Design a protein around this nucleic acid. Structure first.
Ligand SMILES: [Mg+2]
Ligand SMILES: [Mg+2]
Ligand SMILES: [Mg+2]
Ligand SMILES: [Mg+2]
Ligand SMILES: [Mg+2]
Ligand SMILES: [Mg+2]
Ligand SMILES: [Mg+2]
Ligand SMILES: [Mg+2]
Ligand SMILES: [Mg+2]
Ligand SMILES: [Mg+2]
Ligand SMILES: [Mg+2]
Ligand SMILES: [Mg+2]
Ligand SMILES: [Mg+2]
Ligand SMILES: [Mg+2]
Ligand SMILES: [Mg+2]
Ligand SMILES: [Mg+2]
Ligand SMILES: [Mg+2]
Ligand SMILES: [Mg+2]
Ligand SMILES: [Mg+2]
Ligand SMILES: [Mg+2]
Ligand SMILES: [Mg+2]
Ligand SMILES: [Mg+2]
Lengths: 46, 147, 203, 102, 210, 53
RNA sequence: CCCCGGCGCGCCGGGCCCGGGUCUUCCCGGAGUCGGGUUGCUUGGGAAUGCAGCCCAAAGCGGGUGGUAAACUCCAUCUAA
RNA sequence: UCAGUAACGGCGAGUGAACAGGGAAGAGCCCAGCGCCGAAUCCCCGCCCCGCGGCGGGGCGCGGGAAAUGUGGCGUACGGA
């Protein structure tokens, strides 16, 4: 819902920086961990 | 045509030409090549010596392209080139001999049967027999090997 | 890169980690029915490299097939023939147990198309296979061109004509000198061609 | 001397110019990459060794190399596969000595 | 039963061969059908050649046929690369492509490279939009002459390099064809054992030396 | 699968066409074939190419 | 004379913002599968052509094939599950 | 066509392919994986416009859902980014 808003505002900003965010998924996180681009990894126990 | 065959002439003759005593029974003696080592042994031994038994090494997966080697004798050697090729060489004076390439004619080995005309020739082939090369050398020619 | 580790991890089936997981899971699989809808692929890495995608219209089924050979089903072991055909035990079925698993899943869900299957465990009595099936009438399948092939009527019951990967292994297909039996597409195809008399008009 | 191409012998063959080109990319299949080596060394840390590999290593510790190969060959199946396997376990045993020495 | 002198015959008629007899009474009707599909196809792709894509030259394998060349499946990536033709663009302009085929020698590679360049010189290319020509397209004058081609494109033929009569030299007269062949077979037959004997010989004397 | 069809050597078939043409130019043979050619001006009978149109 | 089809030419609203050559740095593969033993069937496939059961059970310049089992060694050729 | 041939076979009766060669036809491709892209992906519901006997296209919904246990774009051994 709020990504739709950002794009609409980007259109308004156009008609006239990426904040930090978590990274989900074992495929995304594994690649980050191999690249040393992750500072803390949280793993579900189940 | 069936009008020219024995059946038409055998109408009215009992037994149809197979005899009254022996008759024409289904398969007396067996079917096919039955009895070769038995009641049919004389025919096989008499007319097919060597039929039974084994001889020589087996060779699995024989590829008959590997042993392709068509041969030509010397008595046929000059047919592989036109007639004017021979007459021109025989009558010229510089001593130049024509080139006969037996591979182009579809042969690989040159054999020695026959005699050559007294005319120098350069022969190209993959293989020669010993007598082929001597006979080719006796007329002033040379043997050329190709791969 | 997680799918790489899982693929490599599942190659160490005699490791302590894998032995524990296979042992407990075979036990769990053994407490259920022979045909069982599964909620998700037990092996996400293996399933997807066999053509599975995590989208609506792909379903997973777990099948339990009894291990061992094919006993000839004749009464009291009598075959009524020549000694060459007196065998009752030590005979084997022409197709694999993975194939039989796909056929049992395929026959049950006649409205689904069987994509592939994989091995999830086995004990002395049971082999366990998960079978990937596709609903050929869901719109996540019909509207995607890459998967429109399996909605065609020529692809009905692939597992029952030896067209799946597991099914097609018992057909003796392949290129080269090892598979001269099935030149022409199949054993019968090779046989027909080799056992037909060509009588040309002018002969 | 005079020498001709021949259909027989060590230099048999019709003579052509050999042309050198990069090997087809299909010919590198099965070449170990530093990332794939890293992933395999990680799984080896999590998983460990198989019971037959461990038994083979016990044979190699007591310097029963000939018996170690026969056990491995009987288990993996072929001489070449066993020769490669025996070497890896010996490398593993050698590494463990060095680590302990450290 | 055999009767006097005769061949021993083994006809293969011990199966149900009558259930699988393939008559050929549809042969003329097959020939008409095949031809009628060649004509409707020639009309469909005109002015493109009816035969199809241009094929390369290749030497037949084995020693029974390597003296002959024929039409291969398609030009190789090395051939197309040397001829400056993009492999994906090759099929669009009548050229066949064979990713499998390898070029082992230069001369065969060059022969197909030249064959491509000759073909590209005969290509009459119609613009994508007829009213809007483009860079590579043929001029409007040579499009009025574009007519469909019958038969294989640039047919492949076995040509023989004729050699004229020359005076035989003493070096050639002296050459020994039979001996050269027989010795060559012996050398290629005893090479491995001879090398082994040389190796063992050195070892035997070395231990005496040292 | 009775053998309905027969091969005839091309050299013989061409021979058979030469024999037919040679025979066609002899009044005795064309008469003896039942044709009423008792008043055709000549044998062979050649007419101008206009009749082709 | 009716109908269906096909092939062409224009407009509206859409999607695509697309390519080639050379350098530089990177990345690259299908596992209870292969292979091995044994058993049964199967094949022209013969110290075992293919298939299957059971047991064993991989590797990564590795693996498969190279029509006689096997070791050492070069080559060639493809890239399985 | 090779070829009733290499081979199989109480090596008896019998059985029995393939490569090469000449023709018919001719067409090539796609994933997983390895990566990078704010999941960029998909299904269903309601309203509006066109079409509506092959139920589709576009616009709008802090409408529901699938999907990070991995959807879509690029990309697949002929190498690719
Ligand atoms: Mg009488
Ligand atoms: Mg009588
Ligand atoms: Mg009589
Ligand atoms: Mg009698
Ligand atoms: Mg009789
Ligand atoms: Mg029997
Ligand atoms: Mg069977
Ligand atoms: Mg197998
Ligand atoms: Mg296939
Ligand atoms: Mg008699
Ligand atoms: Mg007789
Ligand atoms: Mg593959
Ligand atoms: Mg049977
Ligand atoms: Mg049999
Ligand atoms: Mg050998
Ligand atoms: Mg013959
Ligand atoms: Mg006997
Ligand atoms: Mg049989
Ligand atoms: Mg062929
Ligand atoms: Mg053709
Ligand atoms: Mg991917
Ligand atoms: Mg490929």
């Amino acid at each position: 819902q709020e990504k739709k808003q950002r794009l609409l505002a980007r259109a308004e900003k156009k008609a006239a920086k990426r904040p930090p965010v978590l990274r989900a998924g074992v495929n995304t996180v594994t690649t980050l961990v191999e690249n040393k681009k992750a500072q803390l990894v949280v793993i579900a126990h189940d | 045509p069936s009008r020219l065959r024995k059946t038409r002439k055998l109408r009215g003759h009992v037994s149809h030409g197979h005899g009254r005593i022996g008759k024409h029974r289904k398969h007396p003696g067996g079917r096919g090549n039955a009895g070769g080592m038995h009641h049919h042994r004389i025919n096989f031994d008499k007319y097919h010596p060597g039929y039974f038994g084994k001889v020589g090494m087996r060779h699995y997966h024989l590829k008959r392209n590997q042993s392709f080697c068509p041969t030509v004798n010397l008595d046929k050697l000059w047919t592989l080139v036109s007639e004017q090729t021979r007459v021109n060489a025989a009558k010229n004076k510089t001593g130049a001999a024509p080139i006969i390439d037996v591979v182009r004619s579809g042969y690989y080995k040159v054999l020695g049967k026959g005699k050559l005309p007294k005319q120098p020739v350069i022969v190209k082939a993959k293989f020669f027999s010993r007598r082929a090369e001597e006979k080719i050398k006796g007329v002033g020619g040379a043997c050329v090997l190709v791969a | 890169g997680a799918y790489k580790y899982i693929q490599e991890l599942w190659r160490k089936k005699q490791s302590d980690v894998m032995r524990f997981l296979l042992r407990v899971r075979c036990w769990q699989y053994r407490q259920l029915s022979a045909l069982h809808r599964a909620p998700r692929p037990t092996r996400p890495d293996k399933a997807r490299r066999l053509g599975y995608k995590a989208k609506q219209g792909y379903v997973i089924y777990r099948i339990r097939v009894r291990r061992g050979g094919r006993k000839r089903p004749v009464p009291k072991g009598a075959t009524y023939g020549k000694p060459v055909h007196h065998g009752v035990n030590q005979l084997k079925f022409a197709r694999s147990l993975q194939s039989v698993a796909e056929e049992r899943a395929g026959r049950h869900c006649g409205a689904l198309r069987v994509l592939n299957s994989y091995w999830v465990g086995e004990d002395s009595t049971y082999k366990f296979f998960e079978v990937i099936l596709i609903d050929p009438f869901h719109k996540a399948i019909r509207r995607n061109p890459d998967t429109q092939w399996i909605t065609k009527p020529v692809h009905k019951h692939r597992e029952m004509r030896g067209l799946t990967s597991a099914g097609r292994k018992s057909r003796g297909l392949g290129k080269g000198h090892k598979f001269h039996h099935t030149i022409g597409g199949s054993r019968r195809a090779a046989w027909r061609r080799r056992n037909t008399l060509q009588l040309h008009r002018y002969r | 001397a005079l020498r001709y191409p021949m259909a027989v012998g060590l230099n048999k063959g019709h003579k052509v110019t050999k042309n050198v080109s990069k090997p087809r990319h299909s010919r590198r299949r099965g070449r170990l990459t530093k990332h794939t080596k890293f992933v395999r060394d990680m799984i080896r840390e999590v998983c460990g060794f198989a019971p037959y590999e461990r038994r083979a290593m016990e044979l190699l510790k007591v310097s029963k190399d000939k018996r170690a190969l026969k056990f491995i060959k009987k288990r993996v199946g072929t001489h070449i596969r066993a020769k490669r396997k025996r070497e890896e376990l010996s490398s593993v045993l050698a590494a463990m000595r060095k680590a302990a020495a450290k | 039963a055999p009767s006097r002198n005769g061949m021993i015959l083994k006809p293969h008629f011990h199966k149900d061969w009558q259930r699988r007899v393939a008559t050929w009474f549809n042969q003329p009707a097959r020939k008409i059908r095949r031809r009628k599909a060649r004509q409707a196809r020639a009309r469909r792709i005109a002015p493109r050649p009816a035969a199809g894509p241009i094929r390369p030259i290749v030497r037949c394998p084995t020693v029974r046929y390597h003296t002959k060349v024929r039409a291969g499946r398609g030009f190789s990536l090395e051939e197309l690369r040397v001829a400056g033709i993009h492999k994906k663009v090759a099929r669009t302009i009548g050229i066949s492509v064979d990713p499998r085929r390898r070029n082992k020698s230069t001369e065969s590679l060059q022969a197909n490279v030249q064959r491509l360049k000759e073909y590209r010189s005969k290509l009459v290319l119609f613009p994508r939009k007829p009213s809007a020509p483009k860079k590579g397209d043929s001029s409007a004058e040579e499009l009025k002459l574009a007519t469909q081609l019958t038969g294989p494109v640039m047919p492949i033929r076995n040509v023989f390099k004729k050699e004229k009569a020359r005076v035989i030299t003493e070096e050639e007269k002296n050459f020994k064809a039979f001996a050269s062949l027989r010795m060559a077979r012996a050398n290629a037959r005893l090479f491995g054992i001879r090398a082994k004997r040389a190796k063992e010989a050195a070892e035997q004397d070395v231990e005496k030396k040292k | 699968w009775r053998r309905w069809h027969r091969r005839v050597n091309t050299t013989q078939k061409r021979y058979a066409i030469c024999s037919a043409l040679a025979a066609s130019a002899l009044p005795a043979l064309v008469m003896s074939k039942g044709h009423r050619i008792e008043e055709v001006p000549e044998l062979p009978l050649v007419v101008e190419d206009k009749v082709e149109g």
